[PDB]
Amino acid sequence: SLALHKVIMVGSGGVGKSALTLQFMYDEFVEDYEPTKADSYRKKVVLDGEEVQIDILDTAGYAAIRDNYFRSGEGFLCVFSITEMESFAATADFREQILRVKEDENVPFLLVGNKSDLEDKRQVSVEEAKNRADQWNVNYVETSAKTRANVDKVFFDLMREIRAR
Ligand SMILES: Nc1nc2c(ncn2[C@@H]2O[C@H](COP(=O)(O)OP(=O)(O)O)[C@@H](O)[C@H]2O)c(=O)[nH]1
Ligand SMILES: [Mg+2]
Structure with a gap:
């Protein structure tokens, strides 16, 4: 294993x-x-010369169920869309939930600003996202699921944080 x-x-x-x-x-x-579908995925990848298995729980939004899922998680990708300010505001809610369940302010966690390809419709500045990440002592990365920009980066960077726990 x-x-x-x-x-x-x-x-x-x-x-x-x-x-x-x-x-x-x-x-x-x-x-x-499907917007309402939550599922899990698993695949083997090579992380810095070592073959490892990554499991990803894609949440879709009782309390016991959600808490158990967070407890099982070792690292979190906290995603928002750079084109929707409200989604950025909501990251504070997830941060609070994660800290409540994990009871660890140093839990592997990356603030991810997705849809970077839509610069034209950006509502969240790099400055404000970076500032929030700094205050939370976590790293910020902008991604584009469309162009694949920094997609592997966020998953691999998070795995390195999990490995370093
Ligand atoms: N242009 C662009 N659209 C994106 C990007 N990521 C997601 N989308 C679109 O945004 C919609 C919602 O994405 P989805 O991944 O289903 O959102 P979820 O509710 O967070 O799972 C879909 O129509 C996607 O194709 C991105 O990086 N760039
Ligand atoms: Mg979804």
Whole structure:
């Protein structure tokens, strides 16, 4: 059995949780994935010379069920869309939930600003997202599930944080 890294995708609706997951898993940009469907994925990848298994829980939004899922997670990709300010505002809600369940302010966590390809319709500045990440002591990365920009990066960077726990 190889090392297993459990990642959880969180964020408000339509930010790109599923598209990022499927782009990472199948190298395809899926634009119509059922908004209400939560699923898990698993695949073997090579992380810095070592073959490891990554498990990704793509959440879709009772309390006991959601808490158990967060407890099982080892790292979190907190996603928002750079084109929707409200989704950025919502990241504070997920941060609070994760800290409540994990009871660890150093839990592997990346703030992910998705849909970077839509610069034209950006509502969240790089400055404000970076500032929030700094205040939370986490790293910020902008991705595009459409062009694949930084998609592998966020998953691999998070795995390195899980490995370093
Ligand atoms: N242009 C663009 N559209 C994206 C991107 N990521 C997701 N989308 C679109 O946004 C919609 C919602 O994405 P989805 O991954 O299903 O959101 P979820 O609710 O967070 O799972 C879909 O129509 C996607 O094709 C991205 O990086 N760029
Ligand atoms: Mg989804």
